[PDB]
Curated annotation (Swiss-Prot):
The keyword Metal-binding does not apply. ISGylated. S-nitrosylated; negatively regulates the ATPase activity and the activation of eNOS by HSP90AA1. GO terms for cellular component: apical plasma membrane; axonal growth cone; basolateral plasma membrane; brush border membrane; cell surface; cytoplasm; cytosol; dendritic growth cone. It comes from the Eukaryota. The chain holds residues 16 to 223 of 732 of the full protein. Residues 1-208 are annotated as: Interaction with NR3C1. The lineage of its organism: Eukaryota, Metazoa, Chordata, Craniata, Vertebrata. The modification N6-acetyllysine is found at residues 43, 69. Belongs to the heat shock protein 90 family. This is Heat shock protein HSP 90-alpha. One of its GO terms (molecular function) is tau protein binding.
Amino acid sequence: EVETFAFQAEIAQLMSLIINTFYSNKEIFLRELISNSSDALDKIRYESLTDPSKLDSGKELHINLIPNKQDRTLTIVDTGIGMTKADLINNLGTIAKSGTKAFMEALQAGADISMIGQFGVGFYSAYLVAEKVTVITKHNDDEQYAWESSAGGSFTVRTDTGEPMGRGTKVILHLKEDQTEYLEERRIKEIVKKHSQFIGYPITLFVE
Ligand SMILES: O=c1[nH]c2cc(CNS(O)(O)c3cccnc3)ccc2n1-c1cc(Cl)c(O)cc1O
């Protein structure tokens, strides 16, 4: 059973802006996704201070970067708080309608696409490099779900019966044919060092 949803008009417009605008500094997508993972990890860290049983689904708080040259995918895995099915559907737990507005008002006021994260809609910068994005998530209060979208105004949600994660979120970037540089170890290392060198959780770059 696959459910198909329409993006809210402001999100479809934000996604069209990211896909169609000429902007060479595409590498910021990784900073934005690592920042989202760090926010999810802060959230489970905080919640577990009062209820340590919330870490029954996994005590390790980390981020893994997994390139796969054969599948042409870059996967960002975190063991953060995860998202419920409702959260996924409601713009991946973001304030995307009000954030898209504030980002649009900022762009007209002298901002560039790299400031997207300040408006809480940094997730959608994944479409700077990916033709398709799959989000696998597991929250303690819900089952494991897979969100997916190739943009074009719609997304799907289905239960994920493949590899249970325990808790957290997996962002699978199906890279555009001319964005394969983001599968190279030296390029990922460079971007992590430049934009995410002081994240409060271990970032492990997997090798092939
Ligand atoms: O899976 C989750 N759970 C998350 C939880 C948070 C924080 N959620 S909360 O605290 O409910 C919130 C919502 C809206 C505004 N302020 C705070 C942030 C990112 C999360 N993520 C997450 C989201 C994206 Cl898009 C991602 O790339 C990776 C992630 O781990």
